[PDB]
Amino acid sequence: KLPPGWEKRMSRSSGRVYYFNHITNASQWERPSGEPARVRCSHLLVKHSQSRRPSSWRQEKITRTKEEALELINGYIQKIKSGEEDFESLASQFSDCSSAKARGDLGAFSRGQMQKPFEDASFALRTGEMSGPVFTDSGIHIILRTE
Template identity: 55%
Template sequence: MSSPTQVRASHILLKHTGSRNPVDSYRNKQVTRSKQDAIDGIEQIKSQISSHEDFVRLAQEFSECRSAANGGDLGVFGRGQMQQQFEEAAFALQVGELSGLVDSDSGIHIILRLG
């Protein structure tokens, strides 16, 4: 099977003080948590996800990306459009699959592949 050239994915992002832009861009507030606290937070959020509806609700409540307004939905993107770690994880998922923790320059993510 050939690799897709585009995917559609949602994510939940928790930033930390070492993130490239440690500001919650959805709520416009400074992020002061450590990287370990971001990892712990994402693990706790992930443990609450048992459906797509849970993911959307938790993204709206906790994600520190502007995509939180859309339940974390980033839309369709191709290779080279996202940070490498994020892209590799998103393209490796099957449709409907939830990633493990993904560490990028932006922070700690979990990714749900939508298409």
Template identity: 55%
Template sequence: HTALELQRSEGSRTRSPSSPASAKIESADRKRKRPSSSTISSADPSAAKSGSLRDKHRAKAKMSSSAAGAAAAGSQVRASHILIKHEGSRRKASWKDPEGRVIRSTTRESAVSQLKALREDIVAGKAKFEDLASRFSDCSSAKRGGDLGPFGRGQMQKPFEEATYALKVGEISDIVDTDSGVHIIMRTG
């Protein structure tokens, strides 16, 4: 599991250049330009008014979303983790084992002992958390050194959430069991 990310992609319209009608539409589209707020003439007060209303709505939306973000930030934490999936994990595939062949043959006990060894190396100063997360974690956050970014209550599986909130910044958890597999978590914020 990872922090939720939304991506928007805009579709592009394609026209066949072989048809004369589509050529006319294409040239008409090129000629048509949307007036920017700086080109609205003062002779049309309704246009100026709608532009200023639009600006007011944008500013209001921006303020309310930043206020909501600030309110949520107080109750959010930030963490990195290393996830080792095993035969009992709900989803038996990962970025490094898309077919799930290794995961299906990994027992929970084997995953736990691997995590314990990684945790010992981190605590002893032999390795950095983010380096080991990048190499060993079954979560796609491995490409960010295990960083999940900020999250609030109710966004992660309950055992993961409880363990993270119980940690102080910089502390590393013991083994945490979730439906995804077994984890060690480092609270970073």
């Protein structure tokens, strides 16, 4: 009896059930509570040496590995979930996408327009909800659905 894309999982380190979304890679302790033509999202992108365009306003030659990019992504997720940092502030400071200028805002879009893994996570999110790591050809994303 779980919303779309959510499933119950067992955590081995703590021995407790949690909830996992296999579309967004979101996870949380708490049980989670047509689809629209368009959603609005912000994101924080961390590129790596195998991104389709491995450079950004933050560095001319992006050399980090995929797993280094994932480590940075998880660090940002930790700070956001714990309240140590705001999503928008981290996107402005550290996103490798030029949308960092607008605090990660990408505006509105509909299915078919974005990269498929990005689109699926975005439409699987509920408004105000945040994804886990989402992998695309651009790099690794954190996605926040704002409308």
